[PDB]
Design a protein around this ligand. Sequence first.
Ligand SMILES: OC[C@H]1O[C@H](O[C@H]2[C@@H](O)[C@@H](CO)O[C@@H](O[C@H]3[C@H](O)[C@@H](O)[C@H](O)O[C@@H]3CO)[C@@H]2O)[C@H](O)[C@@H](O)[C@H]1O
Ligand SMILES: [Ca+2]
Length: 121
Amino acid sequence: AWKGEVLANNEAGQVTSIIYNPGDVITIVAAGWASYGPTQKWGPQGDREHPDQGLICHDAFCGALVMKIGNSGTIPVNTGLFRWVAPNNVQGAITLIYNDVPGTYGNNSGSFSVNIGKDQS
Ligand SMILES: OC[C@H]1O[C@H](O[C@H]2[C@@H](O)[C@@H](CO)O[C@@H](O[C@H]3[C@H](O)[C@@H](O)[C@H](O)O[C@@H]3CO)[C@@H]2O)[C@H](O)[C@@H](O)[C@H]1O
Ligand SMILES: [Ca+2]
């Protein structure tokens, strides 16, 4: 089980110690406040009013928490996942990422605190 911080201005994202293996069931809970530029801050679901200007994850709002499992595309996490199972052939290290447009991460601020564990399976 892993606990750590995911900085909004961390473009490469935060690698975790969780390796998702076939058949794993995982639960994630994310909390906190971040911004992708403005003086306002948003939670892990991001800013529901803001258009997509080339986000790393087109399936979540700008300012939301997303992840990659190994070589995968981005997958929405938002506030978290309850006893979640990945698609077939998705496996590897979980990297947690703040959803912004590539190259726009420098004006970001705040972070989300995140817990990940593996469930019974
Ligand atoms: O989308 C990710 C980026 O969001 C922020 O950039 C925004 C900022 O530059 C504002 C300035 O007010 O403009 C935003 O785009 C506007 C556009 O200027 C308008 O013509 C249009 O009507 O609306 C859009 C959306 O509000 C722009 O999105 C951050 O500053 C960047 O770092 C990125 O994270
Ligand atoms: Ca930004």
